[PDB]
mmCIF file of C-alpha atoms and ligand atoms in Angstrom:
data_model
loop_
_atom_site.group_PDB
_atom_site.id
_atom_site.type_symbol
_atom_site.label_atom_id
_atom_site.label_comp_id
_atom_site.label_asym_id
_atom_site.label_seq_id
_atom_site.Cartn_x
_atom_site.Cartn_y
_atom_site.Cartn_z
ATOM 1 C CA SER A 291 85.794 68.102 84.727
ATOM 2 C CA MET A 292 82.121 67.626 83.885
ATOM 3 C CA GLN A 293 79.299 70.082 84.363
ATOM 4 C CA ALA A 294 77.834 68.526 87.508
ATOM 5 C CA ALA A 295 81.204 68.883 89.250
ATOM 6 C CA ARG A 296 81.685 72.487 88.099
ATOM 7 C CA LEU A 297 78.202 73.409 89.301
ATOM 8 C CA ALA A 298 78.734 71.564 92.609
ATOM 9 C CA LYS A 299 81.935 73.613 93.001
ATOM 10 C CA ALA A 300 80.116 76.885 92.258
ATOM 11 C CA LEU A 301 77.408 76.147 94.806
ATOM 12 C CA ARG A 302 79.948 75.184 97.475
ATOM 13 C CA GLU A 303 81.652 78.537 96.797
ATOM 14 C CA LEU A 304 78.298 80.274 97.183
ATOM 15 C CA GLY A 305 77.859 78.548 100.536
ATOM 16 C CA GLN A 306 81.221 79.981 101.682
ATOM 17 C CA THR A 307 80.304 83.642 101.033
ATOM 18 C CA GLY A 308 78.195 84.353 104.084
ATOM 19 C CA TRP A 309 75.880 86.359 101.789
ATOM 20 C CA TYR A 310 73.775 83.570 100.323
ATOM 21 C CA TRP A 311 70.404 83.807 102.142
ATOM 22 C CA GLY A 312 68.626 80.619 101.014
ATOM 23 C CA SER A 313 64.842 80.927 100.949
ATOM 24 C CA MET A 314 64.029 84.625 101.121
ATOM 25 C CA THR A 315 61.073 86.429 99.601
ATOM 26 C CA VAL A 316 61.065 89.624 97.569
ATOM 27 C CA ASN A 317 59.550 91.545 100.490
ATOM 28 C CA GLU A 318 62.130 90.206 102.959
ATOM 29 C CA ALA A 319 64.979 91.201 100.660
ATOM 30 C CA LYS A 320 63.353 94.633 100.296
ATOM 31 C CA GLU A 321 63.111 95.113 104.078
ATOM 32 C CA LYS A 322 66.741 94.069 104.540
ATOM 33 C CA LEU A 323 68.060 96.358 101.783
ATOM 34 C CA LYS A 324 65.752 99.396 102.371
ATOM 35 C CA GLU A 325 68.287 101.602 104.142
ATOM 36 C CA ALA A 326 71.457 99.930 102.887
ATOM 37 C CA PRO A 327 74.091 101.786 100.832
ATOM 38 C CA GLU A 328 73.631 101.751 97.061
ATOM 39 C CA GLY A 329 75.193 98.642 95.624
ATOM 40 C CA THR A 330 74.593 96.454 98.673
ATOM 41 C CA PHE A 331 73.684 92.997 97.429
ATOM 42 C CA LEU A 332 72.895 89.452 98.454
ATOM 43 C CA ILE A 333 72.081 86.229 96.646
ATOM 44 C CA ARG A 334 69.037 84.138 97.523
ATOM 45 C CA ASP A 335 67.004 81.297 96.055
ATOM 46 C CA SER A 336 64.677 82.276 93.232
ATOM 47 C CA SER A 337 61.035 81.456 93.799
ATOM 48 C CA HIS A 338 60.703 81.139 89.973
ATOM 49 C CA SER A 339 60.587 77.663 88.421
ATOM 50 C CA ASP A 340 63.235 78.370 85.750
ATOM 51 C CA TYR A 341 65.921 79.821 88.034
ATOM 52 C CA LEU A 342 68.048 78.613 90.921
ATOM 53 C CA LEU A 343 69.277 81.988 92.191
ATOM 54 C CA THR A 344 68.374 85.677 92.308
ATOM 55 C CA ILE A 345 70.486 88.720 93.238
ATOM 56 C CA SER A 346 68.760 91.304 95.403
ATOM 57 C CA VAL A 347 70.487 94.681 95.241
ATOM 58 C CA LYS A 348 69.947 98.186 96.574
ATOM 59 C CA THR A 349 69.700 100.552 93.580
ATOM 60 C CA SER A 350 69.365 104.300 92.934
ATOM 61 C CA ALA A 351 65.620 103.822 93.124
ATOM 62 C CA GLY A 352 65.454 101.199 95.874
ATOM 63 C CA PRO A 353 65.859 97.430 96.185
ATOM 64 C CA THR A 354 65.389 95.249 93.127
ATOM 65 C CA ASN A 355 65.894 91.650 92.086
ATOM 66 C CA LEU A 356 67.752 90.286 89.047
ATOM 67 C CA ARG A 357 67.459 86.611 88.373
ATOM 68 C CA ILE A 358 70.630 84.729 87.488
ATOM 69 C CA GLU A 359 70.349 82.583 84.377
ATOM 70 C CA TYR A 360 72.266 79.316 84.310
ATOM 71 C CA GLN A 361 72.662 78.180 80.693
ATOM 72 C CA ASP A 362 75.290 76.036 78.922
ATOM 73 C CA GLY A 363 77.129 75.507 82.181
ATOM 74 C CA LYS A 364 77.504 79.218 83.010
ATOM 75 C CA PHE A 365 75.812 81.858 85.164
ATOM 76 C CA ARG A 366 74.848 85.212 83.691
ATOM 77 C CA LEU A 367 72.589 88.099 84.708
ATOM 78 C CA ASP A 368 69.048 88.135 83.333
ATOM 79 C CA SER A 369 69.006 90.539 80.374
ATOM 80 C CA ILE A 370 66.261 92.088 78.266
ATOM 81 C CA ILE A 371 68.397 92.391 75.110
ATOM 82 C CA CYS A 372 71.729 90.801 74.547
ATOM 83 C CA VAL A 373 74.632 89.987 72.318
ATOM 84 C CA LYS A 374 76.304 86.706 73.338
ATOM 85 C CA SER A 375 79.858 88.066 73.146
ATOM 86 C CA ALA A 376 78.867 91.033 75.343
ATOM 87 C CA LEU A 377 77.224 89.259 78.290
ATOM 88 C CA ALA A 378 79.626 88.076 81.000
ATOM 89 C CA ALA A 379 79.103 84.405 81.880
ATOM 90 C CA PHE A 380 81.058 82.226 84.323
ATOM 91 C CA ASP A 381 81.193 78.674 85.686
ATOM 92 C CA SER A 382 81.136 80.209 89.150
ATOM 93 C CA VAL A 383 78.275 82.436 90.322
ATOM 94 C CA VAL A 384 80.570 84.047 92.921
ATOM 95 C CA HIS A 385 82.977 84.723 90.050
ATOM 96 C CA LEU A 386 80.123 86.528 88.253
ATOM 97 C CA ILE A 387 79.427 88.759 91.269
ATOM 98 C CA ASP A 388 83.129 89.354 91.894
ATOM 99 C CA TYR A 389 83.604 90.374 88.249
ATOM 100 C CA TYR A 390 80.896 92.992 88.515
ATOM 101 C CA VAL A 391 82.142 94.290 91.912
ATOM 102 C CA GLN A 392 85.618 94.720 90.423
ATOM 103 C CA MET A 393 84.102 96.428 87.375
ATOM 104 C CA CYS A 394 82.057 98.767 89.568
ATOM 105 C CA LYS A 395 85.024 100.038 91.555
ATOM 106 C CA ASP A 396 84.847 102.755 88.846
ATOM 107 C CA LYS A 397 81.496 104.511 89.505
ATOM 108 C CA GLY A 398 66.318 108.480 84.425
ATOM 109 C CA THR A 399 66.967 104.769 83.853
ATOM 110 C CA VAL A 400 68.591 103.159 86.893
ATOM 111 C CA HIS A 401 72.183 101.930 86.599
ATOM 112 C CA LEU A 402 73.314 98.646 88.094
ATOM 113 C CA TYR A 403 75.842 99.083 90.876
ATOM 114 C CA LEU A 404 77.324 96.312 93.043
ATOM 115 C CA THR A 405 79.694 97.048 95.947
ATOM 116 C CA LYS A 406 79.380 95.168 99.221
ATOM 117 C CA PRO A 407 77.486 92.066 100.332
ATOM 118 C CA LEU A 408 74.817 91.949 103.007
ATOM 119 C CA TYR A 409 75.922 89.074 105.232
ATOM 120 C CA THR A 410 73.336 86.658 106.564
ATOM 121 C CA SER A 411 75.921 85.251 108.985
ATOM 122 C CA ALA A 412 79.508 85.911 109.946
ATOM 123 C CA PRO A 413 81.931 83.889 107.784
ATOM 124 C CA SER A 414 84.686 82.009 109.554
ATOM 125 C CA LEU A 415 87.785 83.894 110.577
ATOM 126 C CA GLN A 416 89.696 81.672 108.120
ATOM 127 C CA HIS A 417 87.463 82.779 105.238
ATOM 128 C CA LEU A 418 87.629 86.444 106.310
ATOM 129 C CA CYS A 419 91.441 86.238 106.321
ATOM 130 C CA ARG A 420 91.259 84.673 102.854
ATOM 131 C CA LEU A 421 89.163 87.601 101.625
ATOM 132 C CA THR A 422 91.670 90.094 103.040
ATOM 133 C CA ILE A 423 94.595 88.229 101.470
ATOM 134 C CA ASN A 424 92.781 88.139 98.102
ATOM 135 C CA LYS A 425 92.332 91.900 98.360
ATOM 136 C CA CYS A 426 96.041 92.331 99.105
ATOM 137 C CA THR A 427 97.464 90.107 96.369
ATOM 138 C CA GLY A 428 96.617 87.858 93.458
ATOM 139 C CA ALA A 429 99.845 85.879 93.865
ATOM 140 C CA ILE A 430 99.533 83.648 96.907
ATOM 141 C CA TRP A 431 102.017 80.888 96.036
ATOM 142 C CA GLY A 432 104.940 83.060 97.121
ATOM 143 C CA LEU A 433 103.489 83.915 100.536
ATOM 144 C CA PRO A 434 105.110 82.621 103.762
ATOM 145 C CA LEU A 435 102.380 80.021 104.410
ATOM 146 C CA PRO A 436 102.414 76.210 104.548
ATOM 147 C CA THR A 437 101.199 74.737 101.292
ATOM 148 C CA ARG A 438 98.077 73.293 102.961
ATOM 149 C CA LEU A 439 96.974 76.913 103.504
ATOM 150 C CA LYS A 440 98.046 77.927 100.007
ATOM 151 C CA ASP A 441 95.658 75.168 98.829
ATOM 152 C CA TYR A 442 93.002 76.689 101.107
ATOM 153 C CA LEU A 443 93.480 80.144 99.535
ATOM 154 C CA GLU A 444 93.311 78.584 96.073
ATOM 155 C CA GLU A 445 89.853 77.199 96.775
ATOM 156 C CA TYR A 446 88.346 80.717 96.811
ATOM 157 C CA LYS A 447 90.096 83.459 94.827
ATOM 158 C CA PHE A 448 87.407 86.160 95.034
ATOM 159 C CA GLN A 449 87.515 89.487 96.851
ATOM 160 C CA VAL A 450 83.862 89.271 97.992
ATOM 161 C CA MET Z 123 83.256 78.981 134.458
ATOM 162 C CA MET Z 124 81.446 81.890 132.814
ATOM 163 C CA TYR Z 125 84.932 83.023 131.688
ATOM 164 C CA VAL Z 126 87.979 81.056 130.520
ATOM 165 C CA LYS Z 127 91.577 82.270 130.261
ATOM 166 C CA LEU Z 128 93.525 81.939 126.987
ATOM 167 C CA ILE Z 129 97.271 82.482 127.264
ATOM 168 C CA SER Z 130 99.356 83.561 124.273
ATOM 169 C CA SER Z 131 102.831 82.358 123.390
ATOM 170 C CA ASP Z 132 104.370 85.483 124.909
ATOM 171 C CA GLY Z 133 102.330 85.076 128.096
ATOM 172 C CA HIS Z 134 99.484 87.537 127.694
ATOM 173 C CA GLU Z 135 96.382 86.367 129.545
ATOM 174 C CA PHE Z 136 93.038 86.906 127.784
ATOM 175 C CA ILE Z 137 89.976 86.345 129.927
ATOM 176 C CA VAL Z 138 86.971 85.816 127.669
ATOM 177 C CA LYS Z 139 83.524 84.331 128.040
ATOM 178 C CA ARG Z 140 83.556 80.542 127.773
ATOM 179 C CA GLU Z 141 80.665 80.640 125.277
ATOM 180 C CA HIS Z 142 82.770 82.971 123.143
ATOM 181 C CA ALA Z 143 85.866 80.744 123.212
ATOM 182 C CA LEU Z 144 83.707 77.802 122.077
ATOM 183 C CA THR Z 145 83.642 79.609 118.712
ATOM 184 C CA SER Z 146 86.982 77.839 118.194
ATOM 185 C CA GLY Z 147 86.417 74.181 117.357
ATOM 186 C CA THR Z 148 89.851 73.442 118.753
ATOM 187 C CA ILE Z 149 89.131 75.132 122.082
ATOM 188 C CA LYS Z 150 85.693 73.538 122.265
ATOM 189 C CA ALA Z 151 87.166 70.061 121.827
ATOM 190 C CA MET Z 152 89.715 70.882 124.526
ATOM 191 C CA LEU Z 153 87.093 72.155 127.054
ATOM 192 C CA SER Z 154 83.948 70.250 126.140
ATOM 193 C CA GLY Z 155 85.759 67.007 125.661
ATOM 194 C CA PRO Z 156 86.807 64.130 127.910
ATOM 195 C CA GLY Z 157 88.770 64.072 131.140
ATOM 196 C CA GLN Z 158 88.743 62.624 134.633
ATOM 197 C CA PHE Z 159 85.727 63.383 136.839
ATOM 198 C CA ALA Z 160 87.464 63.462 140.213
ATOM 199 C CA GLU Z 161 90.388 65.621 139.099
ATOM 200 C CA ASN Z 162 90.995 69.329 139.171
ATOM 201 C CA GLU Z 163 90.672 70.932 135.722
ATOM 202 C CA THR Z 164 92.658 74.078 134.893
ATOM 203 C CA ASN Z 165 90.379 76.805 133.477
ATOM 204 C CA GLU Z 166 93.227 78.097 131.225
ATOM 205 C CA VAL Z 167 94.418 77.170 127.718
ATOM 206 C CA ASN Z 168 98.025 77.921 126.719
ATOM 207 C CA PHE Z 169 98.963 78.403 123.056
ATOM 208 C CA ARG Z 170 102.677 77.904 122.431
ATOM 209 C CA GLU Z 171 102.555 79.319 118.873
ATOM 210 C CA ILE Z 172 99.885 82.054 118.890
ATOM 211 C CA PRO Z 173 101.329 85.456 119.913
ATOM 212 C CA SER Z 174 99.306 88.089 121.733
ATOM 213 C CA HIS Z 175 98.677 90.447 118.814
ATOM 214 C CA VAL Z 176 97.148 87.510 117.005
ATOM 215 C CA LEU Z 177 95.251 85.997 119.950
ATOM 216 C CA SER Z 178 93.761 89.366 120.855
ATOM 217 C CA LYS Z 179 92.361 89.722 117.320
ATOM 218 C CA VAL Z 180 91.057 86.159 117.568
ATOM 219 C CA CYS Z 181 89.184 87.070 120.770
ATOM 220 C CA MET Z 182 87.664 90.063 118.977
ATOM 221 C CA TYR Z 183 86.495 87.620 116.300
ATOM 222 C CA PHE Z 184 84.890 85.489 119.025
ATOM 223 C CA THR Z 185 82.952 88.506 120.320
ATOM 224 C CA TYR Z 186 81.911 89.483 116.782
ATOM 225 C CA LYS Z 187 80.872 85.962 115.848
ATOM 226 C CA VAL Z 188 78.729 85.488 118.951
ATOM 227 C CA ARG Z 189 77.124 88.931 118.685
ATOM 228 C CA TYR Z 190 76.160 88.448 115.024
ATOM 229 C CA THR Z 191 74.999 84.819 115.201
ATOM 230 C CA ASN Z 192 71.226 84.299 115.334
ATOM 231 C CA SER Z 193 70.778 88.086 115.324
ATOM 232 C CA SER Z 194 68.501 90.391 113.359
ATOM 233 C CA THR Z 195 71.231 93.056 113.521
ATOM 234 C CA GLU Z 196 72.914 93.925 110.221
ATOM 235 C CA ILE Z 197 76.405 92.391 110.242
ATOM 236 C CA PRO Z 198 79.243 94.943 109.938
ATOM 237 C CA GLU Z 199 82.686 94.264 108.514
ATOM 238 C CA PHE Z 200 85.279 92.531 110.687
ATOM 239 C CA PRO Z 201 88.399 94.634 110.039
ATOM 240 C CA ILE Z 202 91.611 92.717 109.379
ATOM 241 C CA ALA Z 203 94.780 94.646 108.694
ATOM 242 C CA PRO Z 204 96.804 93.216 105.784
ATOM 243 C CA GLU Z 205 99.845 93.160 108.105
ATOM 244 C CA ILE Z 206 98.203 90.533 110.343
ATOM 245 C CA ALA Z 207 96.222 88.471 107.834
ATOM 246 C CA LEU Z 208 98.784 85.671 107.270
ATOM 247 C CA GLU Z 209 99.364 85.001 110.985
ATOM 248 C CA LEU Z 210 95.651 85.404 111.664
ATOM 249 C CA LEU Z 211 94.810 82.866 108.936
ATOM 250 C CA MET Z 212 97.281 80.383 110.445
ATOM 251 C CA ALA Z 213 95.838 80.850 113.946
ATOM 252 C CA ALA Z 214 92.222 80.662 112.723
ATOM 253 C CA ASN Z 215 93.027 77.456 110.892
ATOM 254 C CA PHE Z 216 94.750 75.929 113.935
ATOM 255 C CA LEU Z 217 91.790 77.020 116.095
ATOM 256 C CA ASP Z 218 89.117 75.896 113.601
ATOM 257 C CA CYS Z 219 87.222 79.148 113.643
ATOM 258 C CA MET W 267 72.935 99.962 123.899
ATOM 259 C CA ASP W 268 75.889 97.571 124.461
ATOM 260 C CA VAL W 269 79.551 98.626 124.459
ATOM 261 C CA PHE W 270 82.316 96.088 123.939
ATOM 262 C CA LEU W 271 85.431 96.450 126.006
ATOM 263 C CA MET W 272 88.949 95.224 126.651
ATOM 264 C CA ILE W 273 89.794 95.854 130.307
ATOM 265 C CA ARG W 274 93.588 95.771 130.476
ATOM 266 C CA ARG W 275 96.151 95.657 133.277
ATOM 267 C CA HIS W 276 99.769 94.502 132.945
ATOM 268 C CA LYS W 277 99.574 91.260 130.894
ATOM 269 C CA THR W 278 95.836 90.711 131.611
ATOM 270 C CA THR W 279 93.110 91.605 129.128
ATOM 271 C CA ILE W 280 89.414 90.949 129.940
ATOM 272 C CA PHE W 281 87.002 90.916 126.986
ATOM 273 C CA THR W 282 83.551 91.888 128.178
ATOM 274 C CA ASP W 283 80.510 94.006 127.390
ATOM 275 C CA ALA W 284 78.275 96.352 129.359
ATOM 276 C CA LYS W 285 75.368 98.705 128.802
ATOM 277 C CA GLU W 286 76.315 102.174 127.638
ATOM 278 C CA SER W 287 74.031 103.472 130.416
ATOM 279 C CA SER W 288 75.723 101.355 133.116
ATOM 280 C CA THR W 289 78.330 103.013 135.337
ATOM 281 C CA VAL W 290 82.049 102.833 136.058
ATOM 282 C CA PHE W 291 81.265 101.463 139.524
ATOM 283 C CA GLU W 292 79.211 98.623 138.050
ATOM 284 C CA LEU W 293 82.070 97.892 135.653
ATOM 285 C CA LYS W 294 84.342 97.610 138.701
ATOM 286 C CA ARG W 295 81.909 95.063 140.124
ATOM 287 C CA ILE W 296 82.322 93.070 136.891
ATOM 288 C CA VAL W 297 86.079 93.205 137.307
ATOM 289 C CA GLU W 298 85.556 92.103 140.921
ATOM 290 C CA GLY W 299 83.751 88.996 139.797
ATOM 291 C CA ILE W 300 86.704 88.081 137.558
ATOM 292 C CA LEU W 301 89.952 89.257 139.205
ATOM 293 C CA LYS W 302 88.658 89.077 142.813
ATOM 294 C CA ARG W 303 89.518 92.633 143.943
ATOM 295 C CA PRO W 304 86.901 95.049 145.314
ATOM 296 C CA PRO W 305 85.906 98.267 143.506
ATOM 297 C CA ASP W 306 87.679 100.444 146.077
ATOM 298 C CA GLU W 307 90.910 98.649 145.113
ATOM 299 C CA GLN W 308 90.378 99.491 141.412
ATOM 300 C CA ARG W 309 90.945 102.561 139.262
ATOM 301 C CA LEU W 310 89.645 102.445 135.696
ATOM 302 C CA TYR W 311 90.965 104.676 132.931
ATOM 303 C CA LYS W 312 90.132 105.772 129.419
ATOM 304 C CA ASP W 313 93.587 106.445 128.032
ATOM 305 C CA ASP W 314 95.139 108.525 130.808
ATOM 306 C CA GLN W 315 91.832 109.834 132.221
ATOM 307 C CA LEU W 316 90.639 108.463 135.548
ATOM 308 C CA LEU W 317 86.976 107.461 135.290
ATOM 309 C CA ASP W 318 84.639 108.496 138.092
ATOM 310 C CA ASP W 319 82.485 105.752 139.601
ATOM 311 C CA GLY W 320 79.231 107.657 139.071
ATOM 312 C CA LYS W 321 79.641 108.253 135.327
ATOM 313 C CA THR W 322 77.944 106.048 132.785
ATOM 314 C CA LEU W 323 80.139 104.336 130.224
ATOM 315 C CA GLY W 324 78.686 106.524 127.468
ATOM 316 C CA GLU W 325 79.537 109.594 129.540
ATOM 317 C CA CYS W 326 83.126 108.340 129.660
ATOM 318 C CA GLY W 327 83.227 108.059 125.853
ATOM 319 C CA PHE W 328 82.401 104.342 125.469
ATOM 320 C CA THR W 329 79.535 104.398 122.941
ATOM 321 C CA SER W 330 78.034 101.835 120.577
ATOM 322 C CA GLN W 331 79.863 103.727 117.813
ATOM 323 C CA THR W 332 83.256 103.629 119.549
ATOM 324 C CA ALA W 333 83.119 100.287 121.421
ATOM 325 C CA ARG W 334 82.087 97.589 118.882
ATOM 326 C CA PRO W 335 82.458 93.772 119.162
ATOM 327 C CA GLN W 336 84.928 93.683 116.256
ATOM 328 C CA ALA W 337 86.826 96.713 117.622
ATOM 329 C CA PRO W 338 86.383 96.953 121.390
ATOM 330 C CA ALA W 339 87.421 99.987 123.393
ATOM 331 C CA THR W 340 90.277 99.638 125.870
ATOM 332 C CA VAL W 341 89.710 100.366 129.573
ATOM 333 C CA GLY W 342 92.865 100.601 131.705
ATOM 334 C CA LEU W 343 92.869 99.054 135.203
ATOM 335 C CA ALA W 344 95.088 99.709 138.231
ATOM 336 C CA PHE W 345 94.947 97.866 141.558
ATOM 337 C CA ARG W 346 95.613 99.284 145.031
ATOM 338 C CA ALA W 347 98.752 97.834 146.615
ATOM 339 C CA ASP W 348 98.170 98.063 150.384
ATOM 340 C CA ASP W 349 97.647 101.806 150.879
ATOM 341 C CA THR W 350 98.487 103.368 147.485
ATOM 342 C CA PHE W 351 97.460 102.669 143.906
ATOM 343 C CA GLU W 352 99.902 101.321 141.371
ATOM 344 C CA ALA W 353 100.562 103.387 138.295
ATOM 345 C CA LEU W 354 98.521 102.385 135.284
ATOM 346 C CA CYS W 355 100.624 99.951 133.266
ATOM 347 C CA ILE W 356 99.490 97.999 130.255
ATOM 348 C CA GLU W 357 101.963 95.627 128.602
ATOM 349 C CA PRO W 358 101.781 96.012 124.801
ATOM 350 C CA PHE W 359 100.861 93.071 122.627
ATOM 351 C CA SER W 360 103.497 91.521 120.359
ATOM 352 C CA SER W 361 104.238 92.916 116.878
ATOM 353 C CA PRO W 362 103.538 91.388 113.448
ATOM 354 C CA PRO W 363 106.429 91.019 111.008
ATOM 355 C CA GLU W 364 106.996 93.429 108.161
ATOM 356 C CA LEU W 365 104.620 92.888 105.252
ATOM 357 C CA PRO W 366 105.986 90.503 102.581
ATOM 358 C CA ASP W 367 107.063 91.857 99.211
ATOM 359 C CA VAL W 368 103.886 91.098 97.233
ATOM 360 C CA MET W 369 101.692 92.678 99.950
ATOM 361 C CA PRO Q 271 60.932 103.296 92.445
ATOM 362 C CA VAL Q 272 62.665 100.518 90.509
ATOM 363 C CA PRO Q 273 60.444 97.488 89.721
ATOM 364 C CA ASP Q 274 60.756 94.480 92.057
ATOM 365 C CA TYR Q 275 62.237 92.443 89.201
ATOM 366 C CA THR Q 276 64.524 93.919 86.552
ATOM 367 C CA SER Q 277 66.939 92.724 83.860
ATOM 368 C CA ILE Q 278 70.105 94.294 82.485
ATOM 369 C CA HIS Q 279 70.760 96.271 79.303
ATOM 370 C CA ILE Q 280 74.413 97.078 78.586
ATOM 371 C CA UNK Q 281 74.557 100.612 77.195
ATOM 372 C CA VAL O 43 90.299 94.449 85.788
ATOM 373 C CA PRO O 44 87.046 94.552 83.727
ATOM 374 C CA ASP O 45 86.554 97.751 81.748
ATOM 375 C CA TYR O 46 83.617 99.623 83.245
ATOM 376 C CA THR O 47 80.443 99.646 81.136
ATOM 377 C CA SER O 48 77.210 101.370 82.148
ATOM 378 C CA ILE O 49 74.479 98.794 82.771
ATOM 379 C CA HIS O 50 70.847 99.891 82.704
ATOM 380 C CA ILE O 51 68.361 97.826 84.675
ATOM 381 C CA UNK O 52 64.915 97.973 83.339
HETATM 382 CO CO1 CO U 782 72.094 105.796 81.795
#
């Protein structure tokens, strides 16, 4: 593949989540996340010129916003100090979120915590089933499903 | 026609709002499609391969989808038991919803 | 303020909603509009408990917490056959298979 | 309260 | 899968 195709794929994935909110200001994100559980998150467009996307997340100390860098074909969280080998970066922005949700299943300066999305709209029943299946198993090619639906499951492997 | 009847493979009859059933692209094409003007039109859809435990969950999805579309209300999880997810996926795909 | 319901009798299930503050009698009028039997030919139940016409749905236990769109509460329905009411009977839905191995 | 915009620091 | 690491957000 080439980069334009991998990025197209990542954005199509993002459009499947049900928790990509499009144009949404800082204040609107704050109002939506005010009373939400810690770790509730959504992705929206960044109003900054150098970034496509921003994560809004309910923290310990209230809602905040972390821009998502896209560099050398991969998404990574904005960081104030980094070591390249230490910062998780993925072709897929949903993969990046899913990685940190999986990491955070195990539990002064605020700590990042990501748990559950804040849906802007209800995903399709097909996609919701796919999420549930992904939470049940990583091995879908042995399931009693026609291969057309195994292909469907393969298009979106994440648990969020 | 406020309500339409959806009949499962094992003969359970689910009476649900028409607007809700239109959540299914397949049902919508069946109801809001062509036909003959002068003829009687049955207000019931039979599914030969969707059983009632699946179709009932599908109807819950219809209610959920309509309630949480174009709403300011925070959207809660739609619970799907692992034991039903494969059949429910197959039915959702057939129904385009 | 809305409660989301499955009104069930034999092999019939009606998906509908009503206000928590609306009454059992008004729910019978809803049923009347769908199944074409008058309220005095209907008994409604929560589980095995007969619901009195004058009670609100919330007073019967159907609340916005317990009767959600994605998990509606079940209301049983019995019809009057001539002079006497049928026993409440709700046909169960089918059963999924056993979970596959890798479940 | 947390600032509106933040960035990460793996400790 | 990923080993948990504390992440400060400043
Ligand atoms: Co710390």
